[PDB]
């Protein structure tokens, strides 16, 4: 198991606009486009993130390179962000796969607002911030999601994701 086969099995693949679960236009593997209500709107940044006319349609080719992006700017905006990189830098590879997972869903802005819960990643807290993190509007409107991530945490393995 890895980053992108985790991500992929938590955003799914979807090759047409959709709304994601908080009603903005998302397309691919979990690629946010706008927040605006607006259909346009939303075309129109597909478009543009694509390089060509879609009609609101890609090709799985087009999903993956979206994904990659993503993810490549999800871990560099990790390693950016003051307040994450520490916590990030002190984990193992599992756990490290855990906070990318939530970068890429809330933005690392979202994500470095749970101070509480890095500082007691950060000092290997498992159990405690396991139950720090469930207090969370994150897991209360995803939460067989934010379980997956949690779980993946606690337990520093894979074990969420094998059967998925
Ligand atoms: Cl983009
Ligand atoms: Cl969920």
Do not use: C
């Not at 945490?153 to 969420?160: H, L, Q």
């Amino acid at each position: 198991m890895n980053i992108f086969e985790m991500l992929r099995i938590d955003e799914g693949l979807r090759l047409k606009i959709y709304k994601a679960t908080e009603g903005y236009y998302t397309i691919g593997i979990g690629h946010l486009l706008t927040k605006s209500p607006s259909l346009n709107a939303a075309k129109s940044e597909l478009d543009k993130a694509i390089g060509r006319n879609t009609n609101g349609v890609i090709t799985k080719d087009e999903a993956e390179k979206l994904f990659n992006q993503d993810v490549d700017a999800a871990v560099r905006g990790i390693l950016r962000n003051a307040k994450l990189k520490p916590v990030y830098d002190s984990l193992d590879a599992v756990r490290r796969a855990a906070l990318i997972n939530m970068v890429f869903q809330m933005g690392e802005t979202g994500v470095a607002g749970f101070t509480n819960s890095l500082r007691m990643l950060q000092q290997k807290r498992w159990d405690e911030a396991a139950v720090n993190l469930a207090k969370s509007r994150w897991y209360n409107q995803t939460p067989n999601r934010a379980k997956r991530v949690i779980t993946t945490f606690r337990t520093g393995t894979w074990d969420a994701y094998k059967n998925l």
